[PDB]
Protein backbone atom coordinates (compact mmCIF):
# COMPACT_ATOMS: atom_id res chain seq x y z
CA UNK A 1 0.00 0.00 0.00
CA UNK A 2 3.08 2.60 0.90
CA UNK A 3 4.29 2.73 -2.36
CA UNK A 4 1.20 2.74 -4.61
CA UNK A 5 0.03 5.62 -2.53
CA UNK A 6 4.15 7.45 -2.54
CA UNK A 7 4.04 7.45 -6.16
CA UNK A 8 2.37 10.85 -5.57
CA UNK A 9 6.01 12.23 -5.22
C1 LIG B 1 1.61 -1.29 -1.18
O1 LIG B 1 1.84 -0.46 -2.02
C2 LIG B 1 2.55 -2.49 -1.10
C3 LIG B 1 3.24 -2.70 -2.26
C4 LIG B 1 4.15 -3.76 -2.30
C5 LIG B 1 4.31 -4.55 -1.22
C6 LIG B 1 5.33 -5.65 -1.28
C7 LIG B 1 5.57 -6.44 -0.18
C8 LIG B 1 6.54 -7.42 -0.26
C9 LIG B 1 7.22 -7.53 -1.42
C10 LIG B 1 8.31 -8.60 -1.57
O2 LIG B 1 8.60 -9.37 -0.74
O3 LIG B 1 8.91 -8.56 -2.83
C11 LIG B 1 9.97 -9.49 -3.02
C12 LIG B 1 10.31 -9.40 -4.52
C13 LIG B 1 6.95 -6.69 -2.49
N1 LIG B 1 6.01 -5.78 -2.38
N2 LIG B 1 3.63 -4.31 -0.11
C14 LIG B 1 2.75 -3.32 -0.02
N1 LIG C 1 6.78 10.62 -6.45
N2 LIG C 1 7.81 9.95 -7.06
C1 LIG C 1 8.15 10.26 -8.42
O1 LIG C 1 7.57 11.09 -9.04
C2 LIG C 1 9.23 9.40 -9.02
C3 LIG C 1 9.57 9.62 -10.34
C4 LIG C 1 10.53 8.82 -10.88
C5 LIG C 1 11.09 7.82 -10.11
C6 LIG C 1 12.14 6.95 -10.74
C7 LIG C 1 12.71 5.94 -9.98
C8 LIG C 1 13.67 5.14 -10.54
C9 LIG C 1 14.03 5.38 -11.85
C10 LIG C 1 15.08 4.47 -12.47
N3 LIG C 1 15.29 4.62 -13.89
O2 LIG C 1 15.68 3.66 -11.83
C11 LIG C 1 13.41 6.42 -12.56
N4 LIG C 1 12.49 7.16 -11.99
N5 LIG C 1 10.73 7.62 -8.87
C12 LIG C 1 9.81 8.37 -8.31
C1 LIG D 1 -3.27 -3.28 -1.60
C2 LIG D 1 -2.11 -2.46 -2.16
CL1 LIG D 1 -2.72 -0.89 -2.71
C3 LIG D 1 -1.46 -3.06 -3.40
C4 LIG D 1 -2.03 -4.11 -4.10
C5 LIG D 1 -1.38 -4.61 -5.22
C6 LIG D 1 -0.18 -4.05 -5.64
C7 LIG D 1 0.38 -3.00 -4.94
C8 LIG D 1 -0.27 -2.51 -3.82
C1 LIG E 1 -5.54 0.86 -1.70
C2 LIG E 1 -6.03 -0.32 -0.86
CL1 LIG E 1 -7.18 -1.27 -1.82
C3 LIG E 1 -6.73 0.16 0.41
C4 LIG E 1 -7.80 1.03 0.32
C5 LIG E 1 -8.42 1.48 1.47
C6 LIG E 1 -8.00 1.06 2.71
C7 LIG E 1 -6.93 0.19 2.80
C8 LIG E 1 -6.30 -0.27 1.65
Do not use: K, V
Not at 4 to 9: D, I, K, P, T
Amino acid sequence: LAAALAQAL
